[PDB]
Every structure is written in structure tokens, then in C-alpha cells.
A paper describes a structure:
One protein that we characterized from this newly-identified LarA subfamily is a putative enzyme from a commensal human gut bacterium B. wexlerae. However, co-expression with the NPN-synthesizing enzymes in L. lactis produced only colorless protein, indicating that the purified LarABw is in the apo state because otherwise the LarAH would be yellow or brown due to the NPN cofactor. Based on the SEC elution profile and comparison to marker proteins, the purified LarABw was in a large oligomeric state with an apparent molecular weight of ~360 kDa. Like other LarAHs, LarABw is a two-domain protein with the putative active site located between the N- and C-terminal domains. The large RMSD of 4.2 Å for the full-length proteins can also be attributed to the different domain orientations – LarABw adopts a conformation with the active site more open to the solvent than LarALp. The basic structure unit of the octamer is a symmetrical dimer in which the C-terminal domain of each protomer contacts through extensive polar interactions, burying 1076 Å2 surface area. Most of the polar interactions are mediated by the conserved Arg434, which uses its guanidinium side chain to form hydrogen bonds with multiple backbone carbonyl oxygen atoms from the other protomer. In contrast, the interactions between the neighboring dimers are mediated by nonconserved residues with only 300-400 Å2 of surface area buried at the interface, consistent with the notion that the octamer forms through the tetramerization of the dimers. A square-shaped cavity with a side length of ~40 Å is found within the octamer with an entrance size of ~16 Å at the centers of the top and bottom tetramers.
The organometallic nickel-pincer nucleotide (NPN) cofactor is composed of a nickel ion pincered by two sulfur and one carbon atoms from a pyridinium 3,5-dithiocarboxylate mononucleotide (P2TMN). Notably, although most LarAHs possess two catalytic histidine residues that are essential for the PCHT mechanism, the second histidine residue (His174 in LarALp) in a small fraction of LarAHs is substituted by other amino acids, often an asparagine which cannot function as a general acid/base in catalysis. In this study, we characterized two members of a newly identified LarA subfamily that lacks one of the catalytic histidine residues conserved in other LarAHs. From the structural data, combined with MS and spectroscopic analysis, as well as genomic context analysis, our findings revealed (1) a unique octameric assembly which is unprecedented among other known LarAHs; (2) a distinct set of active site residues, including the asparagine side chain substitution for the missing histidyl group, suggesting recognition and processing of non-canonical LarA substrates; and (3) genomic and structural evidence hypothetically linking these LarAHs to carbohydrate metabolism.
Residue numbers in the entry:
A (entry chain E): 4 to 210, 234 to 407, 411 to 480
B (entry chain A): 4 to 211, 233 to 407, 412 to 480
C (entry chain H): 4 to 210, 234 to 407, 412 to 480
D (entry chain D): 4 to 210, 233 to 407, 412 to 480
Write the structure that this text describes.
């Protein structure tokens, strides 16, 4: 028997004995994580030896404003020794040694279009010491992209891309960027320039691009971003820490992140891909039950396992489509689904023309600003890759399969039924089945062939 | 760290080392079940030696109408060799050896107020062989309390109890009962005369341990022939321990002699103060019991009734559940209106709602949904107050819409540790005795008692 | 038998004979109120002898604009000899003697987030003479914190608190503050710097803090506030009148307000606290039936009687929970209750994050400005009852679903609730304390005799 | 200052010194009641001294079905020694001494159109001992006008009145009645044949001579007369005399003593203004003082009571919290009735009677009457005297005065303001005022001229 995440618990599937298992922490081991007693030495050596920049003790002085940009709770570790906490601690120590007071240093959570961080979210991000040190003084701020009184206009890049920036990060003397270099389904990395281009701008600037936008910010500001990026493994444990100028550091970190993300394990090309998504993963609770977020997750899974899989791919998923449109967090997705169903739109890519219609809605913008919900444009920042490539996608165990059927996904009730239907219709009676347990509870990797 | 059921998965809790763990079967062993090989001999011996009744061959003759009453899907087994399947199979073999026509055998699924069984439910209850052999012939009928053309008003007992019983059972020449002798929170075992008194009666005969026996004996007196019971005692994993068949009235004490040994566990050394468990979404009555506020209160009241003899008077109950507000309105269409009436009336407690029971059992739309949609009868909710007077505080941990748990009188918190700290603050003190019950709603529950 | 306020009338409770009664003023007598024959002398001596400031005759002249800040109807006396009326009368006499004309003097009712005063509210606050003298010329104004063209920006204090101020009180040559020195459940007092901080600001300035904000206003204006505050007793009768600079006079008034507010009477720690809330108390009609205002009142009662009460204290309350949201006065509290019930809100504090969501609502702001309703941020300006008491019983409720949705226990009669509490929490020998008319009087903080 | 009931508490009024105060029991003393010690002797003497039938021993024998008809909770005391409890207890003692089985005794709560009594109501009516002895056996049944399987169509009287009777009372061998003889606004009395005609009849039999004719038709159809045990009550519902026997011949004797109580001679001047207040809970129950139609009923009752003491320029000033609290759980039909009054050609209340048969046949309201313990929909049509006689009716202190204005009643904010307006317009500057400060809390009496 095989155990796949099903909403909150686990669905059991009786797959043929030719099934293979890939858990990206056990099948192929990641590069060794830095031991917890060598983390201080690694951080000190990285901060004291930046790439294409002087040390923090050289760029800091008394009265020089410092803004530290910290990512939100979507990605990265939340443990007692995560990259964010240690990096902030040692950066603060360096700045205090340089002669910068605590009253000046400001912290900004860079969500961009993700919901603004609450008190509990900041507690989980910064820990227990930084939380008590800075939150009550008003020195920890969540980035608001609709606050026209805190957004500055930098003009347009050489390619005509508009650039809007946070005012707080624009008026400081020392801008510090903290990011986690981790893989993305599209092939890019969530390093320094991508983090600055995504988490500091607004929806207009989001609608090679990231490098241009971040370089435009650096030119307008007058001082380049000091980025301290850590290469994370599947358990969000730092492997290497690279600090300094983002442009000359990003390739250095990528040369090692390619070792972790791209796993050469495949010996054959598979026909059936079996997994399941729990209710709460990635963007938060309700992702595994909201149809549009399910489509995005399935598209990411298709992108990640494209090389390992054959032409007529078949994807079997175990998710609880109870129709749970998490509405305190995605207040616009019900209208999005209704517009998709009750219009002339044959496929998801036909929805893009409504993006500016949703990003400018007053009620959803108010909910984004004050209720801690997603920005209405986040649904258009994808879903179409799932529709192509795969012959059929099965959503087994759904509670309201009408929502999974309205997205174009086939619906069944048990893994064996869906597998038998796929064998009868698409993949024949001898399918190469690949089972992915805990594919959404870990940092997913791009599977490739040993060729 | 301890693990508890939470909706579908598992919520983890950090509890002090003094916490004690109880599993119904793993901690204290149930009496040994008969092995799968000896089910043959045990069933044949039980059928060949009925208690207080002649053997079924004597009861059967050519051209005799036989009605076999099979319980619902709530709690009966459903393994490969469950009691229902084996008992039905051997009864059918013996009846065929008695020369009884196959067209005179009729199966009645006795639900009473539980939803009528569909094709999949009937298949799961009866096994694929019996489902293929009998379903398409039309010989498997779910009991319908509101089918007035197929219900017979017997009259009244001596205690003013109206009696209405299925006409199919009334007109048969051999009534056979299939029953599982399993414990109840109140103490009256669920197999025997209770099965006949509850499963083939309408809500008026339920609205009114001696009551069930009186009603069933009145049924036997009116019919002229007693029910032929085939009751099996089950353990936590729904495995047979002993099989008793014959006259229900005289066989019931014999079955109880072993059901008491199974049900009443004697593992205890201290009077515990805090009871910790969790509600899965699907248990007992089906999917949605762990999120429906009324059904959550019912389950909590059952848990209070089971463990009251091991718990103190300032006890605190901490349960993990996902109070989504998911009433499962396709299966309990009356519970949303019931909840609204609870909130929007002069009702301080749940027992104040019983005066509306006759109001709900007579609703035309809910009765239609019960008959044709496979939903619960509207009077099931009124057939739940022990928790709100026995316990000092009841905590619902990890609720997704904590308004429903608060509206029923239960406190709400976010994590097990937070609720335990609050309870230690106010109710049980900083040095409590904790009893943790993982997999309490996944296994057949038992009554806990002091060792002495 | 015992009589407790129940909505509009009274519920009767057969409490055991060991029950104790505390009524403010009646049980322990307050300091003697100034006789009506000495009020003129007291006011004249206070105004002629200010603290840290000179007399109104020494600061006033011909053409110098004067703005008099007067509190709203929530607190203070509405009698024929209340502090507001007499203070305004004698201040006007002094100013007229100095040389200031009536055409210039302006009156501002400082509510802040409380509803703007209507014609009848000004009636009750000011009296016949001042009403007829000043309202019909448009010289009595109710403070509007949402009026962007009548609010000025003073920047941000040294600690990081933004300061918004009323324009009328900013452009005047002589700002005069009238406040009442009365106790608060949290420990602080009303009137003085607190009145100016919470009265003529907006919700952003409200979200030692009051001292910093008020000193920032005084620095920006250049004229310190001339505060004339009277220490009130349980019947809103003046005990002492202190005039002058607020910073150097607040301790002087506090040294005597501590004598009245802090009553050392207890001889034992009580287990059960029994009282009842009428429908109309404090913030107006519907407070005793609105679940959120009920929770606020219960929290205030918990704060006031914390020292007299045991660790396992049980509160029994008699209120008519008819679900009567005074939707013409609290248009937002139904949405607030629905958000509390239908979201991931385990407790009331978890709702604070929605404060900025409500304070910026356009419809509720319009209703606050023009309909005379509460500002939507007043609700977020609660948990103490949940943290402290083992159980809270709301007896006599009409729709107990609302009292249950707040986390409170619901019963039907005092005896049933008392028996339940005895069986569950407080045992069979509880120290019961009964508070008749605890919401119809100026409540006091009960302390221990020793 | 004067005090009046106002919702739940008391509104205070400033009235001139010429105002006269009347309290039914205190101003003029009722005839002396029998003491609590002599209740036993008086009850035994009354039971042993019938007024036209043989004693209860003669009617009783082995195997006799006895049906005892107990009035509703609307009227009559609920003290420790109320008439219902004592009469039932002594009747049961006599029947047991006569050899009547306990299983052949059945109690019927005669409500007729009032809501069916619940468990708590039955407990309060019957006393704890009798409730424990008889309720759980199933021997206490509330009358159900719409229970067609338990209703018998007796036939028709000579006036065309149709007669429908409770089947339980019809088949019994001894029908016994418990009744309280206290006055009505119309001049009748609530005990005697009226109890039979109203309590155990449906709405068709309801839509002084009529009650007697219907009850005597019932007696002639059953073959045996009702055995009545009627008690005269004072303001505090205390017994003055107990009359038992044939109702037709006993009724004048009971009336001879009820006249001395109901009619009070305390008038020396023709009063002009009548001042009182409606409490929230009185007569029919909670919500009578706030429901506009029940407020009109109460005002009409007051007008009928005090019409012989007041002039022809009547002004009625009443304090009530008319907040629109219809108590829809007890009067579910009154909101629709109010809407039909407002939104049709109804100029006055008596114009609505043509819809009475429309409401009494409603299925939803009948279901709520049978199963939810609400009023029968025809109760509201069983109200025009107030608007006919009084020149102006003032509702003082209403919280939603739209309902008081919609029924034709003037609305003001305070007692003094309404009195000033009435003096200005109707009664002049020198009126005669009669103040009733406990009119709705005590059993009302009919005021009359002293001469």
C-alpha cells in the first residue's frame, strides 16, 4: 500500500509493484547542510567577505538609516536556527559595532502580493527575541503596495517596464536584502534580484526582467542592494551563505543551488504520476481545496516532472475539493471562478484580460490592505501548463467534484478506480507509475534523467 | 509527544510525563475471539442449538415467507467475514436445506431513523456475493418509517406506548433478526430486543431497557411467533467472540454475561482530572460528525457517559476537532434550522429544545429528504446534556470556525498546550492528572472503571 | 431577597444569608461634597488662584479668540449645579470682565469617538441659559474627527505617536479645557491631559501616552491648556475644583481622587460576584443588551473588583440579551459580531487586526459624521473577563445565543446559576458579594481594609 | 411624582395635585377572603354541598373514566394554595375514596386558542406534587383544536352555531371542570359555561347566551352534565367562596358574589385623562406590552373597564416600550396581520375581520400552534372601542413609535409633554386626572359612580 496526503490525513492506494518512490530527502541525498555549531562561523566569514561590496562596518555610520528587507512566511525555514533569524542577528551585531543605533534600524516584510503579515506571522518569522525587540516600537512593517503615500515612482526601465518601489526602502542609507535561494518550477531561483523585484513593487510592475527592474532601483537609489542569501535544502537548512552585491553573487549561489534542485535520478520515462496535496501547503490553508490554487499546484508539478515523464502523462491527485474557497484569504477567487464558468472562456489563459479588472477593484484592495488577504492580481501573476502535456488529470477523493470538473480535471472517488480508468483509456495495461509521497510537504526538486 | 485525531489527520500535543494513555484493545486485552477457522463450527453449533426456540429447520417449511432483518451500516463489521455476511450465508444454506423458496426470502435493512441504505451501502453491508444474488431481484429493502402503505399500527402496550412496525415483517412467516451485541454509553447493549424495537419502528414509537423489551414482546404477541435472533458479541475490531441464537428474551442475559466482560474495562489507579482526545471527521454516524456542532455535542456527551466513573467532579475535557461549520446538509438537512432555533430562542440549554421535536419529525420536506434522498430522519436529533453539567469546562482545540463550538457552550482555543495551560490556570490546578485517549473514536469504545 | 437591575426593572435573587452588600457612597461614605452655598466661592477661589498659570483676566483681551472644550454626555453630571454649567458660567463671567466679547467665544463638545452631540444632548450638557445664549448663533460645535478640513497635523511625538488635532482648538488664542476627574477601570483618571488626548483627536492618535500627546499639542500651539477640573463623587457632586496648568495640577487632583475612588472596605476574598446591568448605562441605551458592550462592561467590573475577589471567582449577571443591537448608534457591531463568529477568532483580542478595516469604512464614517453614531474604531479602542473568571453567568437572557457566542454561560434564574456555580466551581460555601446599582452610580475600585 | 410601569421598570411622571390614584385592592378593599386555614373546610363543604347534581361519590364507581378540565396559565393564581391545586387535590382524594382507578383519570388543559402548555407551564399550573404524579404517565394533555383525530363534531345548536368538542372529554364518564369566576371587560365572567365553550372548542365554534347554548348542547349530547368547581378570586387570586355543582344553576350564585368584587364604587367626579402604563409581560404573556395589536387589545379593555367613570372627551396616556417586539415565536401571524393592516384598504381595525377565516386556515400557523406552542392564528380576530370612544390615545416613551402611530395612537417622548399637548388640545388647561399605577399588575376591576 501507498500513503498519499489527502487534505489533512492520508489516502491509501494499492498500486502495482512496478511503482517507484521519490521522496526528495531520501532517494537522492542533498548536499550536506552546515552543522549548527558552524553556522556562526559561516555567517561571520560570509559577512566579512562579501562579493563586490565592502563590509557592513565600512558602509555604516552614526545616523545612517538602515532598512532590512525580510521575506514573508511563504518560503524559508521557521525553525530556531533559520536563515532569517541568524542573518538578522549577525547583521544587527555588525551594524551596532559599526555605530548604528537600534532606534533607527527598520524592518520590512516583503510580501508584494501575498497577504500582509500579522502579529503571529511576524512572531513566527522573526522568532521571540527580534519580535520583542522591534515590533512594539513600530519598526517592523509589512509592505503595502496600494499605499500611494509610501510608494515612489522610479519611471520606466529601458524595456518600458514601469517601476514602483517602497518609499521606506528608497529613503534609507543602507538597504539590506535577505532572501532564500531556492528553486522555482519555471527554472529560475528566488534569489536576491527576484526578491527585490517582486516583494517591493506593486502589481503594475509585476504584470532578465527582474535584473533590469532591480538594477533600475539600484541606479535610482544610488547605493546597490546588500543581499545576504542562503542556499536552502529540502528541510530549509542552509548549505552556503553568500553576501554582497546581488549581480556578482547570484551566479555563485546558483552554481550550488543547481546541485540541490536538479536531481539526476530517472532511469526510465514514466506514464502515470501519483501524488496528493494536503489542505495547507505553500500559500497557506485552503490551497489544496481551492480549485484555482489546485490548478496552479498541478501546473507546478507538471513543470517540475516534465523531463522524467513521457508524452501521454497521466496525473492522479488526492485532494478534498469540498468547495472550500478560503475567503478571508482569497476574497476574489469565487468571483474569478464564476467569471471563468459563466463567460465565453474555453481555457484559463482566456482570463488574463480581466487581470486589470481585478487588480483595481476597491473592495478587494481594501481587504488586501486591512484584512490580510491576497492582492487581487495574484491570481494573474501558470494554470495552462496542466491542460496541455497531460492526457488526463484525476482528482480522487473530492468532496464537491463539481469544482474539480469545472476546471477541466476528471473526478473519481478512489485511487484504484482512477488508475483502472487511466489504464483502460490512456496509458495501457503496463504503465510506469511514479508515486510521490510528501511532494508538497518538502522543498520540491526538478527530476531529471541520468543521461 | 502525543498524537490525536484531528479532522482527517493528526494534531500533536505536548503533555506532561504523568499523562496516561488508554487504547481500548491494545492496553487491556479483550476476551479472545474465535479464530477465522472456527467460525464455521461456532456458527453451526449456535444455529443447531437455539436457546428457547426450535431449530430453524422446524420453523421452516415449503412455501414459507422469511424476512431477515439486517442492521444498518453504523457499527456492524464490514470485514471479509463479518457477522452479518456469515450469519446470513449460513441461515440461507439452512433454509434452503429446509426447502424454502428463494422468492420468499426478503431482506430488510433496519435503520429506523438513520438514512436508508443505498446500493453501495447495501453492497458493503451484504458482501459482493449476496449483493449480486439478492439486490437486483428486489429482495433488499431499506426500512421506511414514513411509508404509510407498508407500516402496520399494532396498537399500544400497557405503558401507553404506540407501536408501528414494518408490514413486511408483520406479514412474514419466519422473522429472523441479525444483531451485534455491543455496548452503549447508557449501558443498554445494541443487540437483541433493542434492534427490533428501534430499527423497524417509526419516530412515534421511539419518542416515548424495559421499553424496548415491552415493545418487542408486544410485537411478538401480535405476530404470533417470536423473532429468531442470531446475535454475535463483538470486540473493538468487530470480531466475533461468541454467537448466541434463539429466543431473544432468554438469550439476552447469556449474551450480556460476555458483553459485560468485554465492555467494562477495569484499568484505573487514580481519579483523572483532564481527558484529552480528538474527533475525526468521519466516525459513528458518518462523515460530518466531527464538524457538526450537534453531533459533536452528542459525541462529547457519549464520552462523558463512558468515562464518568474514572474522572473527578472538576474534570476538564479537551478535544481537537475542525469545527468548519460543515453540517453536511445533504445528510442532516434539519440541523441548520435546529442550530438557528437554538441560537434565536429562549433556550439556555440543549434539553430546552425537545419541545420542538414533534415539530421537526412532522416536517414534509425533511421527511421527503429522509425517504428519497438518504438523509437522517428529522427526529434523530431529538432522540446531549450530560456534558454541560458533568464537566467544568469543555475545550474545542483547533476549530476552523470556532463560533459554532462557542455557540453550543464549548470553549475554544488554538492549540492543545494553550488550552491545557488555561485549564491548569483556572480549573484543575498546576498539578493535574491527565488521561489521553488516542484512537478513541476509531475503535469500539469501552466503559472505563476503577481497578478496585 | 435581593434586587438587581435587569434591563429596565429588577430581577429578584434568593442569595444565602452570608451575602454581603456594597453600594458606593451608601456603604462607605465619600468625602463631603461642597454645599451649594459654597460652590460660587470655591469656583471663584480656584479660578483666581490657578496652578502654574495666571488668571483668565491676565491672559484675555479684546479680540483674543477663546475656545472652551466641554466633554460629552457620557460622563459627568447633568444636574442644575453640575461642574460643566457652573465652570462655563464663571469662566464666561471672568472673560467678559477681562474684555472678550460673546461673538468670539466658541464651545466645542469633545467626544472623539463617541457620537456627535445633537440638539437634546447639548440641551442636557449646557442647560437652558447657555443653550439659548450660544447654540442658535452656531457657537456650539461637536468635534468631528473625520472632518479632514477641520483637523490639523501636528506631526509625531518623540515616542512615535501621530498627533491629529481639532483646527478650532488649534487657532484660538486661549484654549480652555473642562474635564471631570473620575476613576477609570484601568487605573488612570479622566479629565486633564487624558481628556485633551482622547477628545479632540482622531482614531489614529488613539490606536503616559496621553501626557506626551497633550504636551506635543501645547508645544505646537504655544499656549498651554487652561484646565478647570472638578473631583466628582458617586452622585457627580463636586468635591474640589482645581484650575490652571494641567501638568502641575493633575497630581493635586489625583491625591484627593484616590481618597474617593479607592475604597478600603473588604475583610475577605469573595468567590461569587452578583450584579445586573440595566439596558441604558454608560455609553447609552442598548449597552446592557449589546454583546460586545456587555463584554466590555464585564471586563470593567472584573478590573474594578479584582483585588476583592478570589482566583476562581464566578460572575453572575442579569441582563436582557434580546439581541438588541442599537444599530442606529452602533451600526458596525452587527458586522463585528458576525466577523467574530464566522472567522478564525478563538478570542476577542484576535479581532484587533480588523480595527483599521473598520475605522476606514466609508459608510460607517458617514453614519458617524451625520447620523450621530459611534466611530467604527470605538470597539477596538474585553479579554480580562475571559482570562480572570472561571465562569460568567448571564441570567434572564431573552436570546441567550448572543451571550453564548461571546463565551459567557447562560441560565434563566439567579438560583439556577448560583446552584450550578456551587456544584461546579466555588463549592458549597461561597463568599457571595452582591452589588445593587453598580451601573447606576459612579463605580469605585474595591480594595482590602488591611 | 407618580410611578407607572414602563416595559419592565417604572417611568416617573409629574402630575398636578388634583390627580387621583386608584389601586384595585388597596383603595377599595375586596370582600374578605377565606383564610388559608379555612380553605380545607370550605372546599370540603362545597364538594359535599352541590348545587344541582349528586355528590361526586354518587357519580363515581369502579372502572369510571374521569376527565378533569383545568384552565390555562393566563388567568388564575399559581400560589401554594391556588384554586386549581387545592380543587384538583381534594377532587382526587374524593374520587380515590369512591374507588376510581388512577389510570382512568385524565387531565385536559383547556386553552382553546391560547398556546398549548409546555412542561414548565404544566408544572406551574398543577403544582410540583401533581406534576410529578401525573405528567410522566401521560395523563396531562393540552387541548388541540386542530387535532382532527381527537375532535368530535357534535352537530349544531338552534342558532346555527357549529359545535366541535374535545374527544377526550366526550368519551369520559365523569367530566369535571375547574374554573375561576373573575370578571371580563365585556361584563361576563371567565368561569362556568364560558370555560366549556371556549377551552375545548375549535375556532369555528368561537367565530353570554352563546356560551350557555353551546355548553348545554354539549351536556345533552354527552348525556351527563359537567361537574363544575368554580372559585371566586380577588385581585391577588385568592379564593372568596367555592361553588360546585350544576353549572347552569350555580352560575347565578357565583355571579352574586363576583359582582361585589368586579364593580367598585369609587367615583365622585367625571375624570378626563386616564394615565397608566403597559408592562412587557401581562395577561397573555411576554410581548403584550410591545406588540401593537396586543397593545390595542389592552387599551380597548381599559376603555371598556373605565368608560363609566370618564367623560366624553377621553384622553388616555400610556407608557409603553413599543419597540416592535412582536414576539414572533409566540405570535407568528401578527407581523403578516400588521402588514395587511398597513398595506390594504383597511381604514380601521374592524375592517380586518374578513381575513379571519383566511388566517385560521393557514397551514404554517396551524403547525406552529400545534407543535411550537404559539397562539392559534384566529386568536387575533376574537380593538375598535378605544378608537371609537377616546378623543386621543398617547403612547409615551415608545422606542419605535412607528408601530404606535400605525395603529392610530399618538406618540410622545415623556409623560409631561403628552399631558401638556392633551391640555392644549382636548381636555383644556384644568382637567381631571385619574392615575392607575398598578392597573395591569393586578386583577382589573370595573370602576363606577359612587352614587
Amino acid at each position: 500500500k501507498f500513503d498519499f496526503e489527502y487534505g489533512q490525513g492520508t489516502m491509501s492506494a494499492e498500486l502495482p509493484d512496478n511503482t517507484d518512490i521519490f521522496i526528495p530527502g531520501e532517494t537522492v541525498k542533498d548536499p550536506d547542510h552546515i552543522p549548527e555549531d558552524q553556522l556562526e562561523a559561516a555567517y561571520l566569514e560570509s559577512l566579512a567577505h562579501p562579493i563586490g561590496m565592502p563590509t557592513l562596518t565600512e558602509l555604516a555610520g552614526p545616523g545612517k538609516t538602515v532598512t532590512i528587507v525580510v521575506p514573508d512566511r511563504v518560503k524559508g525555514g521557521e525553525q530556531a536556527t533559520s536563515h532569517r533569524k541568524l542573518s538578522i542577528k549577525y547583521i544587527l551585531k555588525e551594524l551596532y559595532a559599526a555605530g548604528v543605533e537600534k532606534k533607527d534600524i527598520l524592518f520590512i516584510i516583503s510580501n508584494g502580493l501575498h497577504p500582509r503579515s500579522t502579529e503571529a506571522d511576524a512572531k513566527a518569522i522573526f522568532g521571540e527575541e527580534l519580535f520583542n525587540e522591534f515590533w512594539h516600537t513600530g519598526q517592523i512593517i509589512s509592505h503595502d503596495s496600494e499605499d500611494q503615500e509610501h510608494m515612489v515612482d522610479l519611471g520606466t526601465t529601458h524595456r518600458g517596464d514601469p517601476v514602483y518601489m517602497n518609499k521606506y526602502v528608497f529613503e534609507c542609507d543602507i538597504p539590506i536584502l535577505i532572501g532564500h535561494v531556492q528553486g522555482n518550477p519555471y527554472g529560475g531561483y528566488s534569489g536576491g534580484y527576484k526578491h527585490s523585484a517582486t516583494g517591493i513593487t506593486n502589481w503594475k510592475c509585476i504584470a532578465n526582467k527582474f535584473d533590469e527592474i532591480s538594477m533600475h532601483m539600484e541606479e535610482k537609489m544610488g547605493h546597490p542592494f546588500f543581499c545576504c542569501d542562503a542556499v536552502l535544502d529540502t528541510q530549509s537548512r542552509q548549505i552556503a551563505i553568500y553576501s554582497g552585491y546581488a549581480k556578482e553573487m547570484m551566479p555563485i549561489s546558483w552554481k550550488l543551488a543547481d546541485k540541490r534542485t536538479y536531481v539526476h535520478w530517472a532511469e526510465k520515462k514514466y506514464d502515470v504520476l501519483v501524488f496528493g496535496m494536503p489542505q495547507k501547503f505553500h500559500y497557506g490553508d485552503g490551497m489544496g481545496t481551492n480549485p484555482i490554487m489546485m490548478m496552479q499546484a498541478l501546473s507546478a508539478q507538471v513543470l517540475r516532472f516534465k523531463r522524467v515523464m513521457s508524452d501521454n502523462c497521466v496525473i492522479i491527485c488526492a485532494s478534498t475539493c469540498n468547495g472550500y474557497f478560503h475567503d478571508e484569504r482569497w476574497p476574489y477567487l469565487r468571483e474569478l471562478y464564476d467569471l471563468f464558468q459563466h463567460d465565453h472562456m474555453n481555457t484559463l489563459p482566456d482570463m488574463n484580460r480581466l487581470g486589470e479588472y481585478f487588480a483595481t477593484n476597491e473592495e478587494y484592495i481594501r481587504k488586501y490592505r486591512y484584512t490580510n488577504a491576497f492582492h487581487p492580481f495574484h491570481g494573474f501573476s501558470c494554470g495552462h501548463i496542466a491542460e496541455m502535456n497531460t492526457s488526463a488529470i484525476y482528482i480522487v477523493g473530492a468532496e464537491e467534484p463539481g469544482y474539480a470538473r469545472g476546471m477541466g480535471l476528471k473526478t473519481r472517488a478512489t485511487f484504484e478506480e482512477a488508475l483502472e480508468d487511466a489504464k483502460k483509456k490512456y496509458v495501457g495495461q503496463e504503465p510506469n507509475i511514479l508515486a510521490l509521497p510528501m511532494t508538497f510537504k518538502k522543498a520540491a526538486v526538478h527530476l531529471c534523467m541520468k543521461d
